[PDB]
Design a protein around this ligand. Structure first.
Ligand SMILES: Cn1cc(-c2ccnc([C@H]3COCCN3)c2)c(-c2ccc(F)cc2)n1
Length: 283
């Protein structure tokens, strides 16, 4: 069960390669271990992202027996696990506390010349203990460089591309086959926030013969659902957010500060406090 002299491999607990529990024997601390029979590609991204708020720390990376191994600090449940535990209903306060942090995580990945390309509830995990108020972002398996690290030359505009994320949260431009850029991670976040508000999305649970037929039905439903209808009965900020994302040009640097201020002004109008008391903390 030995991993890089100081780690002990525990039980399999999920998938992202498979995810196992483990122990840093020397420090007396539980860890998360990702085993691969892409791990190296992804480890380089995590390494570049190190030091960022809500970026998980990679303790060790190497190879053991038949596997490539990555050791990460242990984090808490995903927003999808917490949403299901909360009966698929989050108060407006929880959605807004989450939106503030999620915009910041996305901005940080973009500042490091990458786009995530798979913004969904399963890829945001709450921290544990003293970091329990922190939203972490994970899984750089589908991530891609959008600009040169030195020159900041944006990748060219490309058409006729495959869907490289989850269909439910994909941007309209992703359904059209356009190369993903910064605007696309933010538009996906906009659908995640509306999903937390509604408990479901209108293009969710569409029946079809093939998965490619289902994506074409999701595309059609998204393109025929006005933002004002999708967001009806919820504060206007959710619609304003999605409209701003949809207006972004391919190589535009999004105004992240404006997007955070949109939700922060609504948060203050509602009289909420930034005490990081989420719905699940009340249970
Ligand atoms: C889908 N996914 C989840 C995790 C993950 C990361 C940290 N802590 C956990 C906790 C969450 O609470 C329950 C116990 N495991 C899971 C991972 C991962 C990613 C990279 C890595 F090197 C290790 C793990 N992927």
């Amino acid at each position: 069960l030995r991993v890089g002299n100081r780690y002990r491999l525990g039980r399999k607990i999920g998938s992202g390669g498979d995810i196992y529990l483990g122990t840093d024997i020397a420090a007396g601390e539980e860890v998360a271990i990702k085993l691969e029979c892409q791990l190296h590609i992804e480890s380089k991204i995590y390494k570049m992202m190190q030091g960022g708020v809500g970026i998980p720390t990679i303790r060790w990376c190497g190879a053991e027996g038949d596997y490539n191994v990555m050791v990460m600090e242990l984090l808490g449940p995903s927003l999808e696990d917490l949403f299901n535990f909360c009966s698929r209903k989050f108060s407006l306060k929880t959605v807004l506390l989450l939106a503030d942090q999620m915009i910041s995580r996305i901005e940080y990945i973009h500042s490091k010349n990458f786009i995530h390309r798979d913004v969904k509830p399963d890829n945001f995990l709450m921290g544990l203990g003293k970091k329990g108020n922190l939203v972490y972002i994970i899984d750089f398996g589908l991530a891609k460089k959008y600009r040169d690290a030195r020159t900041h030359q944006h990748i060219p505009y490309r058409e006729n591309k495959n869907l490289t994320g989850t269909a439910r949260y994909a941007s309209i431009n992703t359904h059209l086959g356009i190369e993903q850029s910064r605007r696309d991670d933010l538009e996906s976040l906009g659908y995640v926030l509306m999903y937390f508000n509604l408990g479901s999305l209108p293009w969710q649970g569409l029946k079809a013969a093939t998965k490619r037929q289902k994506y074409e039905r999701i595309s059609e439903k998204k393109m025929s659902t006005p933002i004002e209808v999708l967001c009806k009965g919820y504060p206007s900020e959710f619609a304003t957010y999605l409209n701003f994302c949809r207006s972004l040009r391919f190589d535009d640097k999004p105004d992240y500060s404006y997007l955070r201020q949109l939700f922060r002004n609504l948060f203050h109008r509602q009289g909420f406090s930034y005490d990081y008391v989420f719905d699940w903390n009340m249970l």
